[PDB]
Short mmCIF file of C-alpha atoms and ligand atoms in Angstrom, two decimals:
data_model
loop_
_atom_site.label_atom_id
_atom_site.label_comp_id
_atom_site.label_asym_id
_atom_site.label_seq_id
_atom_site.Cartn_x
_atom_site.Cartn_y
_atom_site.Cartn_z
CA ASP A 1 43.21 -113.96 47.77
CA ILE A 2 40.93 -115.58 45.20
CA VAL A 3 42.43 -115.44 41.70
CA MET A 4 40.36 -115.83 38.52
CA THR A 5 42.66 -117.32 35.87
CA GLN A 6 41.67 -117.15 32.20
CA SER A 7 44.30 -119.41 30.64
CA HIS A 8 43.91 -117.93 27.14
CA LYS A 9 44.61 -114.29 26.34
CA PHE A 10 43.58 -114.84 22.70
CA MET A 11 41.18 -117.27 21.03
CA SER A 12 40.71 -117.87 17.30
CA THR A 13 37.33 -118.50 15.68
CA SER A 14 35.24 -117.87 12.58
CA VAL A 15 31.81 -116.34 12.03
CA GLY A 16 29.11 -118.93 12.72
CA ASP A 17 31.22 -121.17 14.97
CA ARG A 18 30.96 -121.83 18.71
CA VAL A 19 33.48 -120.51 21.25
CA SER A 20 34.11 -121.64 24.83
CA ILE A 21 36.01 -119.18 27.04
CA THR A 22 37.20 -120.83 30.25
CA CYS A 23 37.82 -119.31 33.68
CA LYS A 24 39.38 -121.08 36.66
CA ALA A 25 38.98 -119.95 40.27
CA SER A 26 41.64 -120.38 42.96
CA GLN A 27 39.11 -121.93 45.36
CA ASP A 28 35.44 -122.91 45.54
CA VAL A 29 33.21 -119.93 44.71
CA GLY A 30 30.02 -121.92 44.06
CA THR A 31 28.10 -120.10 41.32
CA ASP A 32 28.94 -116.52 42.38
CA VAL A 33 30.47 -115.74 38.98
CA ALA A 34 29.72 -113.00 36.44
CA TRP A 35 30.83 -112.48 32.84
CA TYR A 36 31.44 -109.20 31.01
CA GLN A 37 32.17 -107.97 27.49
CA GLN A 38 34.40 -105.00 26.67
CA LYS A 39 34.90 -103.57 23.19
CA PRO A 40 37.91 -101.39 22.32
CA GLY A 41 37.43 -97.85 23.59
CA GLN A 42 34.15 -98.78 25.31
CA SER A 43 33.04 -99.62 28.83
CA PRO A 44 32.45 -103.16 30.11
CA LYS A 45 28.99 -104.68 29.67
CA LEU A 46 27.44 -107.33 31.90
CA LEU A 47 26.54 -110.56 30.09
CA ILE A 48 25.98 -113.25 32.76
CA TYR A 49 25.47 -113.21 36.52
CA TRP A 50 25.05 -116.05 39.02
CA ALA A 51 27.13 -118.24 36.68
CA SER A 52 24.31 -118.87 34.19
CA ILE A 53 21.66 -116.10 34.25
CA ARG A 54 21.73 -113.83 31.21
CA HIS A 55 21.33 -110.12 31.89
CA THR A 56 18.34 -108.32 30.40
CA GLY A 57 18.88 -107.51 26.74
CA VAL A 58 21.68 -110.07 26.30
CA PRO A 59 21.06 -112.30 23.25
CA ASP A 60 20.38 -116.01 23.67
CA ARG A 61 23.71 -116.89 22.02
CA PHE A 62 25.66 -116.15 25.23
CA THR A 63 25.43 -118.94 27.82
CA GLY A 64 27.27 -119.44 31.09
CA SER A 65 27.83 -122.66 33.01
CA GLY A 66 30.01 -124.22 35.68
CA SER A 67 30.09 -124.71 39.44
CA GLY A 68 32.81 -124.69 42.08
CA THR A 69 36.06 -123.63 40.41
CA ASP A 70 35.65 -124.14 36.63
CA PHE A 71 33.39 -121.86 34.58
CA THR A 72 32.79 -121.33 30.87
CA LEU A 73 31.18 -118.65 28.71
CA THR A 74 29.93 -120.22 25.47
CA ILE A 75 29.03 -118.06 22.45
CA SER A 76 26.98 -120.03 19.93
CA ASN A 77 26.92 -118.73 16.34
CA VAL A 78 29.63 -116.07 16.64
CA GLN A 79 28.59 -112.80 15.02
CA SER A 80 30.92 -110.08 13.77
CA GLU A 81 29.70 -107.80 16.59
CA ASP A 82 31.24 -110.22 19.12
CA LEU A 83 34.87 -109.20 18.49
CA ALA A 84 35.62 -108.00 22.02
CA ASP A 85 37.32 -108.79 25.32
CA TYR A 86 35.63 -111.21 27.73
CA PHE A 87 36.47 -111.66 31.41
CA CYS A 88 35.03 -113.35 34.49
CA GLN A 89 34.47 -112.11 38.03
CA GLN A 90 33.81 -113.75 41.40
CA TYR A 91 31.85 -112.32 44.33
CA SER A 92 32.07 -115.23 46.78
CA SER A 93 34.59 -113.44 49.01
CA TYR A 94 36.11 -109.99 49.34
CA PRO A 95 37.99 -108.44 47.63
CA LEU A 96 36.09 -108.83 44.36
CA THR A 97 38.47 -110.04 41.65
CA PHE A 98 38.40 -110.20 37.85
CA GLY A 99 40.07 -112.35 35.26
CA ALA A 100 42.70 -110.91 32.95
CA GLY A 101 40.41 -111.27 29.94
CA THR A 102 40.27 -113.24 26.69
CA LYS A 103 40.10 -111.50 23.31
CA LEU A 104 38.32 -113.11 20.37
CA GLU A 105 40.32 -113.00 17.12
CA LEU A 106 38.62 -113.74 13.80
CA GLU A 107 40.03 -116.28 11.36
CA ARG A 108 40.44 -115.51 7.66
CA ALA A 109 42.67 -116.28 4.69
CA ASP A 110 46.21 -114.95 4.50
CA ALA A 111 46.90 -111.52 3.01
CA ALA A 112 50.13 -109.74 2.09
CA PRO A 113 50.64 -106.21 3.45
CA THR A 114 50.54 -103.04 1.37
CA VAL A 115 53.82 -101.27 2.18
CA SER A 116 54.40 -97.53 1.74
CA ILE A 117 57.48 -95.47 2.62
CA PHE A 118 57.56 -91.71 3.21
CA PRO A 119 60.54 -89.31 3.34
CA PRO A 120 60.75 -86.50 5.91
CA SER A 121 58.51 -83.49 5.42
CA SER A 122 59.76 -79.96 4.84
CA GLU A 123 58.14 -78.86 8.11
CA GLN A 124 60.25 -81.28 10.16
CA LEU A 125 63.45 -80.68 8.17
CA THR A 126 63.07 -76.94 8.84
CA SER A 127 63.02 -77.77 12.57
CA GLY A 128 66.21 -79.86 12.30
CA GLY A 129 64.70 -83.35 12.47
CA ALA A 130 64.10 -86.12 9.95
CA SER A 131 61.64 -88.98 10.49
CA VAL A 132 61.01 -91.76 7.95
CA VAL A 133 57.68 -93.59 8.16
CA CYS A 134 56.67 -97.02 6.82
CA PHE A 135 53.02 -98.08 6.71
CA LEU A 136 52.09 -101.77 6.59
CA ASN A 137 48.35 -102.11 5.96
CA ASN A 138 45.84 -104.96 5.75
CA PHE A 139 47.90 -108.09 6.36
CA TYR A 140 47.02 -111.46 7.89
CA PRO A 141 48.07 -113.21 10.07
CA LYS A 142 49.23 -110.61 12.60
CA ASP A 143 52.77 -112.04 12.85
CA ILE A 144 55.15 -109.71 11.00
CA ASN A 145 58.63 -108.22 11.35
CA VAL A 146 60.08 -104.99 9.94
CA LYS A 147 63.73 -104.00 9.52
CA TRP A 148 65.10 -100.57 8.61
CA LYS A 149 68.14 -100.38 6.32
CA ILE A 150 70.25 -97.26 5.78
CA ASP A 151 72.68 -97.57 2.85
CA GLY A 152 72.27 -101.34 3.09
CA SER A 153 73.02 -101.59 6.83
CA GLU A 154 70.38 -102.48 9.40
CA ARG A 155 69.43 -99.77 11.90
CA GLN A 156 67.60 -100.46 15.17
CA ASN A 157 68.11 -97.34 17.31
CA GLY A 158 65.50 -94.62 16.99
CA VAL A 159 62.72 -96.92 15.73
CA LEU A 160 59.15 -96.71 17.02
CA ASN A 161 56.59 -99.40 16.18
CA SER A 162 52.82 -99.45 16.67
CA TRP A 163 50.16 -102.03 15.80
CA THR A 164 46.41 -101.72 15.39
CA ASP A 165 43.81 -104.17 16.63
CA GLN A 166 41.93 -106.43 14.22
CA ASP A 167 40.06 -104.42 11.60
CA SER A 168 36.29 -104.52 12.11
CA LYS A 169 35.68 -104.52 8.33
CA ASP A 170 38.18 -106.94 6.73
CA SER A 171 39.58 -108.68 9.86
CA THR A 172 43.17 -107.67 9.01
CA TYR A 173 45.94 -105.93 10.96
CA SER A 174 48.07 -102.86 10.34
CA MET A 175 51.38 -101.53 11.63
CA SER A 176 53.36 -98.28 11.47
CA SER A 177 57.12 -97.88 11.88
CA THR A 178 58.83 -94.50 12.35
CA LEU A 179 62.62 -94.13 12.16
CA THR A 180 63.61 -90.80 13.71
CA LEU A 181 66.98 -89.20 12.92
CA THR A 182 68.51 -85.76 13.06
CA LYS A 183 68.68 -83.68 9.88
CA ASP A 184 72.49 -83.81 9.92
CA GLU A 185 72.47 -87.61 10.12
CA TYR A 186 69.75 -87.91 7.46
CA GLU A 187 71.82 -85.90 4.96
CA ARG A 188 74.85 -88.20 5.41
CA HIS A 189 73.28 -91.27 3.74
CA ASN A 190 71.51 -92.10 0.48
CA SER A 191 69.20 -95.15 0.47
CA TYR A 192 66.51 -95.72 3.11
CA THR A 193 64.76 -99.09 3.08
CA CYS A 194 61.81 -100.62 4.94
CA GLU A 195 61.79 -104.43 4.78
CA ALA A 196 58.68 -106.45 5.66
CA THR A 197 58.97 -110.16 6.47
CA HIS A 198 55.61 -111.96 6.30
CA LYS A 199 54.47 -115.55 5.86
CA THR A 200 52.67 -114.62 2.62
CA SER A 201 56.02 -114.09 0.86
CA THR A 202 59.13 -116.26 0.82
CA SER A 203 61.18 -113.10 0.19
CA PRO A 204 60.53 -109.87 2.14
CA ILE A 205 58.54 -107.01 0.65
CA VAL A 206 60.94 -104.10 0.12
CA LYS A 207 60.14 -100.39 -0.22
CA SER A 208 62.90 -97.80 -0.50
CA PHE A 209 63.90 -94.39 -1.83
CA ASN A 210 67.19 -92.71 -2.71
CA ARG A 211 68.06 -89.21 -1.54
CA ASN A 212 70.09 -88.58 -4.70
CA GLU A 213 66.88 -88.81 -6.77
CA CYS A 214 65.36 -86.06 -4.59
CA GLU B 3 17.76 -95.19 31.00
CA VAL B 4 20.68 -95.88 33.35
CA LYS B 5 23.53 -93.47 32.67
CA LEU B 6 26.85 -92.87 34.44
CA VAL B 7 29.39 -90.16 33.58
CA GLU B 8 32.78 -89.87 35.28
CA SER B 9 34.81 -86.68 35.65
CA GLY B 10 37.99 -85.52 37.37
CA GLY B 11 40.66 -87.27 35.29
CA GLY B 12 43.70 -85.73 33.68
CA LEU B 13 47.38 -85.23 34.43
CA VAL B 14 48.44 -84.97 38.08
CA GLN B 15 51.92 -84.88 39.59
CA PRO B 16 53.02 -87.64 42.00
CA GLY B 17 52.21 -87.12 45.66
CA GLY B 18 49.11 -85.05 44.88
CA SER B 19 45.42 -85.45 45.64
CA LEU B 20 42.16 -85.10 43.73
CA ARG B 21 38.51 -86.15 43.76
CA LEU B 22 36.71 -88.05 41.01
CA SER B 23 32.99 -87.60 40.33
CA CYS B 24 30.27 -89.81 38.86
CA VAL B 25 26.94 -88.27 37.81
CA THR B 26 24.10 -90.78 37.58
CA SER B 27 20.62 -90.71 36.05
CA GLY B 28 17.77 -93.00 35.04
CA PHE B 29 17.39 -94.79 38.39
CA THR B 30 16.81 -94.07 42.07
CA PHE B 31 20.37 -93.36 43.21
CA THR B 32 19.93 -94.00 46.94
CA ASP B 33 18.56 -97.53 46.35
CA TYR B 34 21.59 -99.14 44.68
CA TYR B 35 25.11 -100.08 45.69
CA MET B 36 27.73 -97.94 43.94
CA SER B 37 31.36 -98.86 43.34
CA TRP B 38 34.64 -97.74 41.76
CA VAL B 39 36.82 -99.99 39.58
CA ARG B 40 40.13 -99.11 37.91
CA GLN B 41 41.69 -100.54 34.74
CA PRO B 42 45.48 -100.07 34.51
CA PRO B 43 47.15 -100.19 31.07
CA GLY B 44 47.43 -103.81 29.99
CA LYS B 45 46.29 -105.12 33.37
CA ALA B 46 43.19 -106.75 34.82
CA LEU B 47 40.42 -104.69 36.37
CA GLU B 48 40.86 -103.92 40.06
CA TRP B 49 37.90 -103.27 42.35
CA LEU B 50 38.62 -100.43 44.78
CA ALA B 51 35.54 -99.88 46.96
CA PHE B 52 31.76 -99.85 47.11
CA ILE B 53 29.14 -98.12 49.26
CA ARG B 54 25.80 -99.66 50.20
CA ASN B 55 22.30 -98.24 49.70
CA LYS B 56 20.05 -96.37 52.13
CA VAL B 57 18.41 -99.44 53.68
CA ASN B 58 21.89 -100.74 54.58
CA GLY B 59 23.13 -97.56 56.27
CA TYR B 60 25.40 -96.41 53.41
CA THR B 61 28.26 -98.54 54.74
CA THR B 62 31.50 -98.92 52.79
CA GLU B 63 33.88 -101.75 51.95
CA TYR B 64 37.43 -101.21 50.74
CA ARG B 65 40.22 -103.11 49.06
CA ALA B 66 42.91 -103.62 51.70
CA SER B 67 45.61 -102.01 49.54
CA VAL B 68 43.68 -98.72 49.26
CA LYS B 69 42.27 -98.44 52.79
CA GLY B 70 43.35 -95.12 54.28
CA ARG B 71 44.19 -93.85 50.77
CA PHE B 72 40.89 -93.94 48.84
CA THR B 73 37.48 -92.77 50.09
CA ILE B 74 34.11 -93.41 48.43
CA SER B 75 31.05 -91.32 49.29
CA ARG B 76 27.73 -90.04 47.97
CA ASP B 77 26.45 -86.49 47.67
CA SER B 78 23.94 -85.37 50.29
CA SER B 79 21.29 -83.98 47.92
CA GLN B 80 22.43 -85.04 44.42
CA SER B 81 22.86 -88.33 42.57
CA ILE B 82 26.65 -87.98 42.47
CA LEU B 83 29.24 -90.52 43.63
CA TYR B 84 32.74 -89.43 44.66
CA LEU B 85 36.17 -91.02 45.04
CA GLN B 86 38.83 -89.14 47.00
CA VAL B 87 42.44 -90.13 46.26
CA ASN B 88 45.66 -88.97 47.93
CA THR B 89 49.39 -89.75 47.82
CA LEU B 90 49.21 -90.37 44.09
CA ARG B 91 51.96 -92.47 42.51
CA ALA B 92 52.68 -93.52 38.93
CA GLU B 93 51.02 -96.88 39.63
CA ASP B 94 47.64 -95.15 40.04
CA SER B 95 47.56 -94.25 36.33
CA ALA B 96 44.51 -96.03 34.92
CA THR B 97 40.98 -95.65 33.61
CA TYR B 98 38.66 -95.26 36.61
CA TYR B 99 35.16 -96.70 36.18
CA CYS B 100 32.00 -95.81 38.09
CA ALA B 101 29.54 -98.69 38.32
CA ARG B 102 26.14 -99.59 39.73
CA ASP B 103 26.09 -102.86 41.69
CA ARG B 104 23.50 -105.60 42.15
CA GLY B 105 23.25 -108.82 44.12
CA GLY B 106 23.33 -107.40 47.64
CA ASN B 107 26.56 -108.34 49.38
CA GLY B 108 27.34 -110.58 46.40
CA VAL B 109 28.42 -107.54 44.43
CA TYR B 110 28.44 -107.66 40.64
CA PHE B 111 28.49 -104.67 38.31
CA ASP B 112 25.41 -104.45 36.08
CA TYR B 113 26.03 -101.00 34.53
CA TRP B 114 29.32 -99.17 33.97
CA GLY B 115 30.06 -95.55 33.18
CA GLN B 116 32.21 -94.31 30.33
CA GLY B 117 35.22 -93.88 32.61
CA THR B 118 37.78 -91.14 33.20
CA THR B 119 41.51 -91.49 32.59
CA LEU B 120 44.09 -90.51 35.21
CA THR B 121 47.79 -90.01 34.41
CA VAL B 122 50.28 -89.62 37.26
CA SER B 123 53.65 -88.34 36.06
CA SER B 124 56.07 -85.45 36.48
CA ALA B 125 56.43 -84.86 32.73
CA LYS B 126 55.48 -81.44 31.38
CA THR B 127 52.51 -80.88 29.08
CA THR B 128 53.79 -80.39 25.52
CA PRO B 129 51.83 -79.60 22.33
CA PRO B 130 52.31 -81.85 19.29
CA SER B 131 54.08 -81.28 15.99
CA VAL B 132 52.11 -82.45 12.95
CA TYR B 133 54.00 -83.46 9.81
CA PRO B 134 52.43 -84.58 6.51
CA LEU B 135 53.20 -87.93 4.89
CA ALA B 136 53.08 -87.66 1.09
CA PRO B 137 54.47 -89.97 -1.64
CA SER B 145 44.94 -96.38 -8.59
CA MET B 146 44.85 -96.29 -4.79
CA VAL B 147 47.28 -93.94 -3.02
CA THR B 148 48.16 -93.86 0.69
CA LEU B 149 48.70 -90.60 2.58
CA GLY B 150 49.19 -89.93 6.27
CA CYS B 151 50.03 -87.58 9.12
CA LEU B 152 52.75 -87.88 11.78
CA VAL B 153 52.06 -86.55 15.29
CA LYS B 154 55.26 -86.21 17.31
CA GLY B 155 56.50 -84.82 20.60
CA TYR B 156 53.36 -84.34 22.69
CA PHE B 157 52.33 -85.12 26.27
CA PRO B 158 50.03 -86.28 27.76
CA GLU B 159 47.48 -88.54 26.08
CA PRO B 160 45.02 -88.46 24.36
CA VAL B 161 45.15 -87.13 20.79
CA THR B 162 42.27 -87.48 18.32
CA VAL B 163 42.73 -87.50 14.54
CA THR B 164 40.16 -86.97 11.78
CA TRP B 165 40.46 -86.59 8.01
CA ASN B 166 38.66 -83.80 6.14
CA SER B 167 36.84 -82.77 9.35
CA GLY B 168 35.19 -86.20 9.69
CA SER B 169 33.88 -86.47 6.11
CA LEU B 170 36.72 -88.87 5.17
CA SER B 171 36.38 -92.02 7.29
CA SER B 172 36.76 -94.99 4.92
CA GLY B 173 40.24 -96.48 4.77
CA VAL B 174 41.59 -94.63 7.82
CA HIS B 175 44.03 -96.37 10.18
CA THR B 176 44.91 -94.40 13.33
CA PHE B 177 47.64 -96.19 15.25
CA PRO B 178 47.93 -96.04 19.07
CA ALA B 179 50.48 -93.69 20.58
CA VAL B 180 53.94 -94.82 21.72
CA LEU B 181 55.87 -93.23 24.59
CA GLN B 182 59.61 -92.49 24.50
CA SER B 183 61.54 -90.04 26.72
CA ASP B 184 58.36 -88.55 28.23
CA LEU B 185 56.90 -87.75 24.78
CA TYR B 186 54.33 -89.59 22.68
CA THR B 187 54.35 -90.34 18.95
CA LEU B 188 51.27 -91.21 16.88
CA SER B 189 50.57 -91.71 13.18
CA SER B 190 47.49 -92.02 11.00
CA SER B 191 47.08 -93.33 7.45
CA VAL B 192 44.37 -92.99 4.80
CA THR B 193 43.99 -94.59 1.37
CA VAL B 194 42.05 -92.71 -1.32
CA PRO B 195 41.61 -93.30 -5.06
CA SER B 196 44.20 -91.58 -7.22
CA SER B 197 41.40 -89.87 -9.18
CA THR B 198 40.38 -87.95 -6.03
CA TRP B 199 43.84 -86.72 -4.96
CA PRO B 200 45.50 -84.31 -5.51
CA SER B 201 42.55 -83.14 -7.64
CA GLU B 202 40.63 -82.74 -4.36
CA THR B 203 42.14 -81.69 -1.05
CA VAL B 204 42.99 -84.13 1.75
CA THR B 205 43.61 -82.67 5.21
CA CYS B 206 44.20 -84.32 8.59
CA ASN B 207 42.97 -82.66 11.79
CA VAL B 208 44.76 -83.25 15.10
CA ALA B 209 43.37 -82.29 18.51
CA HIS B 210 45.31 -82.20 21.79
CA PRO B 211 42.94 -80.77 24.42
CA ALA B 212 45.55 -80.88 27.20
CA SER B 213 47.32 -77.95 25.48
CA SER B 214 44.35 -76.46 23.56
CA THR B 215 45.89 -77.57 20.26
CA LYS B 216 43.92 -78.09 17.04
CA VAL B 217 46.07 -78.36 13.90
CA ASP B 218 45.02 -78.77 10.27
CA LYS B 219 47.62 -80.15 7.85
CA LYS B 220 46.94 -80.24 4.11
CA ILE B 221 48.65 -83.08 2.25
CA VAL B 222 50.24 -81.70 -0.93
CA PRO B 223 52.05 -83.82 -3.56
CA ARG B 224 55.83 -83.83 -3.75
CA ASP B 225 58.19 -83.32 -6.67
CA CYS B 226 60.47 -86.14 -5.48
ZN1 LIG C 1 47.09 -113.93 18.19
ZN1 LIG C 2 27.60 -115.67 47.76
ZN1 LIG C 3 75.37 -91.64 9.86
ZN1 LIG C 4 20.65 -105.13 35.83
ZN1 LIG C 5 40.95 -101.01 7.52
#
């Protein structure tokens, strides 16, 4: 069937610049193209229909253009309230199909992460488990890598990682890493280390604690 | 004005059936095309079906993959749109959107509802375990472990503490989710004043408060 291909999953820009999000159709769809905006945790919102007609209430900054197979949604003077997902849609033939979407990421200066390490709580140790958590807050760019070290040796099994989307206030990213062990295994080692490799530092940021001191 | 509210989501075992509902308001319901669209996790939106207005005989059009499986219909005397689904599989897990259509047969979606989330799995509902995370600016946190299914909401100090809060999305492993939340407060406000995280898991009627107390080591 007809496939709407948005070549870019992510696009970088700054506040006040102009962005062009492209969308390519598998075959000729004329001008039967719509554009939508979707913010995290919110429903889609119609921006453009019939390739170039703005929906009621849509600001004049959003413009659509294109005919045949190539279409573009241009956002002049990017505001902070435009950090969202944008995708196209064709209604020339059934079934109706959407593009995979293109998320707008905001540019800013680099920032080193604030790293914090936490030992297991008494509530979990009473249950027989032992989880160690490492928070990595407010870094930029989003590219980062975290290693867990137990008594100096790297450990990969039992690790769970999670990343946030771009912060709506300072345009940074955050990540949490949880190393889950049993209480018996936790009591058989001393040092627990969370190592953060980021472009803002030639050497990794290291946070650790020793069980002998507690 | 225009308002759409979906209901019927939740956890359902594979091979089952259910009906989703969409309550509309703010516009003449029988005069507009209505449709259903699903959004799988990390996948593009997928149109399922739409039903025409009164002047077009209330006819329906279906995606070929769902014909014979999904059924769209309107209520006889109320502004409610339905979607019947049978033979549920794990691939049907998604957010299901109710939408009002424009453009005649050139269907586009001019207003979307909030959506309802459907999870198709055989895993058993499990309440969460909430563990505190304690060590000028100091960072605390809460660890939510071993629950199913999604979602879980987290607040700090019953909503009064919102600045500097990072709630990370849940991660699945061995049919159980794990979620964490962090908050950064000035050292002059803790532990001189209390800091408590609140965790809600409506699927198991769970609502836990966990006070963060300082540690000796
Ligand atoms: Zn990126
Ligand atoms: Zn057409
Ligand atoms: Zn060991
Ligand atoms: Zn409209
Ligand atoms: Zn933040």
